[PDB]
Design a protein around this ligand. Sequence first.
Ligand SMILES: CSc1cccc(CC(=O)N2CCC[C@H](C(N)=O)C2)c1
Ligand SMILES: [Zn+2]
Length: 139
Amino acid sequence: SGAIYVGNYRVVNRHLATHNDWANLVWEDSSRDLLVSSTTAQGCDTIARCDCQTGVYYCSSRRKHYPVSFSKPSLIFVEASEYYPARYQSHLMLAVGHSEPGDCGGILRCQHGVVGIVSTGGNGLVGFADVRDLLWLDE
Ligand SMILES: CSc1cccc(CC(=O)N2CCC[C@H](C(N)=O)C2)c1
Ligand SMILES: [Zn+2]
């Protein structure tokens, strides 16, 4: 679990969105596993606007942060799950690092701010949904 809170927006994994997220829907994209809902309170976070390929993510299944080198956002095949059929997930960045299903929502940050959230993983890999291209989150 986890979310990004920026301005009057809440960014979560689309497969973990609640009934309240869908009732306050701003934008969603199944191909990115992202959903953004509106909030009444002002959010705690800053979004990075950069091309960093290193950062640190929070891993809830270890209660620890880990440094990672990650690939640039790209289209990556993701096997079928209870939430989606087998498909290409876009804007996904991979890195070597521990992850389990409940780690989705953990934030990846660089020195400039929030880069994205855990969305996939397996076999010593961890995949992050990028949010740096969503310029409208800042206005
Ligand atoms: C098996 S270790 C693991 C680590 C992190 C996550 C997972 C689960 C996983 O990748 N998916 C299930 C939820 C939706 C995801 C998606 N973005 O399509 C795919 C598994
Ligand atoms: Zn950066």
